[PDB]
Paper text:
Moreover, we observed the apo-form crystal of Pt-Get3a at a resolution of 3.8 Å in the space group as I212121. Two molecules of Pt-Get3a in one asymmetric unit formed a homodimer in both apo and nucleotide-bound Pt-Get3a structures. However, both the structures were similar, with their RMSD ranging from 0.47 to 0.87 Å over all backbone Cα atoms. Moreover, Pt-Get3a existed as a distinct parallelogram-shaped dimer in the crystal, which markedly differed from the structures of classic U-shaped Get3 dimers. The parallelogram-shaped dimer might form due to the lack of the zinc-bound CXXC motif, which coordinates the open-to-closed transition of Get3 for TA protein targeting. In addition, an ellipsoid-shaped tetramer of Pt-Get3a was observed through crystal packing in both crystal structures. Two parallelogram-shaped dimers (A/B and C/D) were assembled in a crystallographic tetramer aligned along the long axis of symmetry. The ellipsoid-shaped tetramer of Pt-Get3a could alternatively consist of two crystallographic homodimers of A/D and B/C monomers aligned along the short axis of symmetry, similar to the classic U-shaped formation of Get3 in the dimer state. Because of the lack of the conserved CXXC motif, monomers in a U-shaped Pt-Get3a dimer (A/D or B/C) are associated through two α-helical hairpins (α10 and N terminus of α11) from each monomer, which are located at the equivalent area of the CXXC motif in other Get3 crystal structures.
A functionally diverse set of tail-anchored (TA) membrane proteins are delivered and inserted into the ER through a posttranslational pathway, termed the guided entry of TA protein (GET) system. In eukaryotes, ranging from microbes to animals, the GET system is mediated by a cytosolic ATPase (termed as TRC40 or ASNA-1 in humans and Get3 in fungi), which coordinates the translocation of TA proteins to the ER by binding with ER-bound receptors (WRB/CAML in mammals, Get1/2 in yeast and Arabidopsis). In this study, we identified two isoforms of Get3 in Phaeodactylum tricornutum, a cytosolic Pt-Get3a and a chloroplast-localized Pt-Get3b protein. Furthermore, we solved the crystal structure of Pt-Get3a and determined that it does not contain the conserved CXXC motif, potentially leading to the spontaneous formation of a distinct parallelogram-shaped dimer in solution.
Residue numbers in the entry:
A (entry chain B): 4 to 89, 105 to 345
B (entry chain A): 5 to 89, 104 to 345
The structure:
Amino acid sequence: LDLPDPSLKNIIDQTTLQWVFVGGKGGVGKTTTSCCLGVQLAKSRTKVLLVSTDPAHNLSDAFCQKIGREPTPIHGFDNLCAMEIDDVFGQMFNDLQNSIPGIDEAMSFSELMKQVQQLDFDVVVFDTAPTGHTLRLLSFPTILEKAFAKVWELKDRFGGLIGQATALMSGGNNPAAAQEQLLGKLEETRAVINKVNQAFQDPTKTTFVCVCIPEFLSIYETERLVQELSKYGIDSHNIVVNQVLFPEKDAEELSAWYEANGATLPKEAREICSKLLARKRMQDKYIGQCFDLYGDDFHVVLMPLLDYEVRGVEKLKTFSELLVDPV
Amino acid sequence: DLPDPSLKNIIDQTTLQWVFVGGKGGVGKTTTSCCLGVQLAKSRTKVLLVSTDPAHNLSDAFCQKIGREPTPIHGFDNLCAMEIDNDVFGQMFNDLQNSIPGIDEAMSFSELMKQVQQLDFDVVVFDTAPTGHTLRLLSFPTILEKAFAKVWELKDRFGGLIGQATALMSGGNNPAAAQEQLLGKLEETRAVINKVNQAFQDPTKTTFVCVCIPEFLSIYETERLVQELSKYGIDSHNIVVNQVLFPEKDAEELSAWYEANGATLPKEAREICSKLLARKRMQDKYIGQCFDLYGDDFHVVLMPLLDYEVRGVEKLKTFSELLVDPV
C-alpha cells in the first residue's frame, strides 16, 4: 500500500506552522508526545514554546524540571521554552459569569492568546486538556455571542431600574458606564478570539495532532475530536496511536510460531505468550479500526509501549526520534 | 394603604411546604432563613432548614455545629438544620458534563430534593446560594432536556461505532448498555426534578422571600430574581429590606436638628452625624426605589441595622420577632 508516512515528520517539514495543537483523552500520552514534538521543533525552528492548559502540572514531571506559569527555558535546549497554565461592574460581571457558563474560560483563553502572541515565538505546541475541555475551547464563539445577547437582554429588560438608579449613585458606579465597560470587555475578548480563530483555520499556520491508544474509549474520543475540528474548520492530519504492543511483529507470524511450538514451552512462558498475543490481537483490531476511519487522509504514527516512563530530557530526546522517523 | 410590613403571611399560609430565601451575598439570607425557621417552629409540627450556600454560614449563625444531615437545633423541639456540600459509563458521563454545563448540579439538586422529600417535614426553609446560582437552579428542567438530547444525538451519530465495539468487549462494559444506563440515570433525575418543579409552580406549596439591602446592587439582583421567578411561574410576594439604618425616624427630624445645631458639635460628633445623614439619605432613596418597584403586590419588611452580628439563638429570636410582627 501507498499511504502517508507513519511519522510526524510532515509537521517538521511544514516550516510555516505557528500553532501545533496536541489533543486526546487523558492518559494516552498527550504530555509526552507534546514534549517530544517541542523537542523536535526546537532543532529547525529559531524559537519554540510549549503551552500546557492541562489542569495538572504534568509538564514539570515530564521534563523533570520545574516549569513556571511564565516561559521557562528547557534544560539542555537554547531555543525551547515551556509554560504551564492551570461595584456595579463587578456585580454585573458576576451575573454574566453565572448566567453564561464558559465566559470566564473564554476570557482566560483570550488573555492567554494575547500573552502568547506578544511573547513572539516561531511555533507554539499546545498540550491541551482532555477532549471534553477542548470541545468547549472550540465552542467559545457561541458562548461569547450568548454573553453579548445576555448583556443586551439584561439592559433592555432592566433599563427602567438601571436608568432610575443611574440618577442616584455617583462616581464610578454608573450602571450604564459599567454596563458599557462590560460590553467593551466582551468585545475585546471576541475580537481577540476572532483573530485567533482566523489564524487557527489556516492549515498553513495551525494543525492538530490527535493522540490515542488501541482501546475503544481513546478511539471514540479521537473521532469526536476529529469531527469537531472538521466542523470548526481546523486542520488535522496526524493520528498518534501510542503504547502499541510490539509495533514490529504481526499477530499472525507469532501466532503461527506459537501454534507450532505451544507444547514445547513451560507453563509460565506459555501463559505469558498467550496473554501477550491476546492483547496484541485486541490492539490490532483497534488499529485496523483506526486505519478504517483514517489513513486515507491522516498520518498514522504507531508508538511502542515502554516499560519506563518517558521522563527526563534525554529519554524524551530519544523518544522523539522514534516519533518523527520510525524504524 | 399597603400590605402588612411583615412576613406573617408566610406563617399564616399553612399550606406552604417550600419557602425559599434568595438574594445577593451579605444581605442576610442566612439570618432571615434561620428566623423564618424559628418562627415556623412555633406553628408547624416539624420544620427543616436546608442550606445550599457554599460556605458553612449556618453553623456560625446558630453558634453550633450543624451536620451534613439534619441536626436538631439546640433548644427547639421541631427545628432541624442541614448544610450541603477505563470506565465507559464514566467517560460518557464526563462527555455529558463537558457538553452540558450544569447537569451535575441538576443531579445533586435532584438527590437533595429526594432526600428532603423522604425526610418528611411539614415545612422546609431554603437558604439558597447567591442570586446567580439560584437562577441556574431554576433552569434545571431545560438543562436535563438538553442533556437528554445530547445523549440521543451522540447515540444517533455513533450508533455504528458503539455497536461495533459492543460486539468486542465483554461483561459490564458494553458501550450501548452504558449509554442506556446514562439515559436511565437522566430519566430518574428528570422525574425527580419534574415532581419538584411541579411542586414549585404551586403557590399553595412554594413561595419565595427576597432579601436585599438599601443599595443599588441588591435591589438590581432582587429585580432580576423576581422577574426570573415570574417567568418560571414561581410565586414571590415578600421582600425583606435588611440592615435599614434607623427604621423609626424619617429623613427629616435628625437632619433638621443637626442643621439647627451643626456648628455646635465637636469634630467627632459632627463627622459621625454627617456620615450617618449621608448613609440615611442614600438608604431612603433606595428604599423609595424598592417601594416603587414593589409594595403593590409584595410585603415589604424593613429590618434595622444592628451593631452586633445576629448570631446565637437569642439574637435570632429577637430578629424573628422583629421579622414577623414589627414595631
